[PDB]
Amino acid sequence: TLKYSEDLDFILSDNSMTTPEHRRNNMLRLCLDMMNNEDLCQYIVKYRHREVWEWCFQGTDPKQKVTSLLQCFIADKIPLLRHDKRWAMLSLENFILPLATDEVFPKKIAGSRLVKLNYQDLLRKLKFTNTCEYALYIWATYLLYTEAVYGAVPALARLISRGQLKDWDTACSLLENNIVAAPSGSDIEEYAQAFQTLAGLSREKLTNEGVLKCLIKLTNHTTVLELSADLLPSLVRSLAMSVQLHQNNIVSSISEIKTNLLILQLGLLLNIVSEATTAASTEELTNFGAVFRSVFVKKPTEMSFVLQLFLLVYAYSAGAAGVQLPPAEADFLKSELEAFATDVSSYNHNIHTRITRVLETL
C-alpha cells in the first residue's frame, strides 16, 4: 500500500543531512513499528528491502550502543539472504566482533520523554536487551559465513573468562568456528592466547561441552601446546580428576550428558598426552591405574567407545610415567587397543594413528 510507502519516505531521512540523535530516533521509531506490525515488515521485505537496509547500515559504530542495538534487531527482523553481499555492511572485524565482546550496555537513553518511553517499550519486546548478546546471536545465526575474523578467537576466549553471560554456547561455537585448519604463525599466536585463557578458567568450565570443544580444536595444533607447555600438567590434573570423579560411567553409562562429557575430556586429554610426554606423566593421570585394574580383572565382552578411549589415554600415561605392566595386563591393553584401531580406522584417522604409535611400545 501507500501509507507504508509514504511512512518510509519519511522515516528513511538522508543520513548525510541529519544529526546522529535524529537518525537514532527515526531508527527507533522504525524498529518499534516493525516490532508492532508484521504487515509493514512484509512490505519492506517485498518491495523496499535494499533501501531500508542501506539506510539502517549506512553508518555503524560499536561505540554507539543504542543505535547498534536497533541495528542488530533490523538484521534479525528482516535478514537479507545468506549470500547477499550487503551483509558486508556489518563489518565482522570492526562492528560485530567489538559489539559481541563488550558487556557494557547503557541503562538510560539520552532523549525526549517520548523517546525514552518508546525505547523501554521496544526493550520489553526485543529478543536481547544488549548488544553483547544480540551481536553474538546475529554473528552465529546469519554470519557463520565468513572467512575467519582477525582477533576473534582470543577476544571470545577473554569474553568467556570474564563470565558475565549465563550461557556460553554461542560464544564457544563462534570461537570454534573461527579456528582455521592451516593457521599462519599469526593465527597460531592467537590460538596460543585463547588456549591459555580457556585453560585458566574455573574447573567448572572444564565440564562445559562448548569450552571443551574449543580446547580440543585449539590443541589440534601442536604448536599451541608448545607455546603453552607450562600450563599443561595443570590442565591434565583437572581433567584427570574429573574423569576419576565419573569413573562409574566409563565402563557402563545410561547418561548421555555424562558420556559425551567423558568422551570430550578424554579427547582433550588425548590431544595433550599424545603430544607432550612431560604432561602424559602428570601424577594424577597415573591414578587412571586404578580404573584400568578394575577393567582388566573383571573383563567385559563388550567395550564401548568411552572405555576404549580411556584405555588409549591410559596407555599414554603409563608409558610416559615408566609404568611397567606385567605380561597379562600389557597383552589385554595391546589387544583391546588393536580392536579399537580396527573400528576407528575408517572414521577417525587421528585416533587410529595415535593407537598405532602407542602399540609400538607394547
Binding site: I216, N220, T259, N260, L264, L309, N350
Partner: peptide, 11 residues
Amino acid sequence: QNRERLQLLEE
C-alpha cells in the same frame, strides 16, 4: 547419527 566420536580432532 549424532554420537560424539571426536571427528573434531581432524579439523
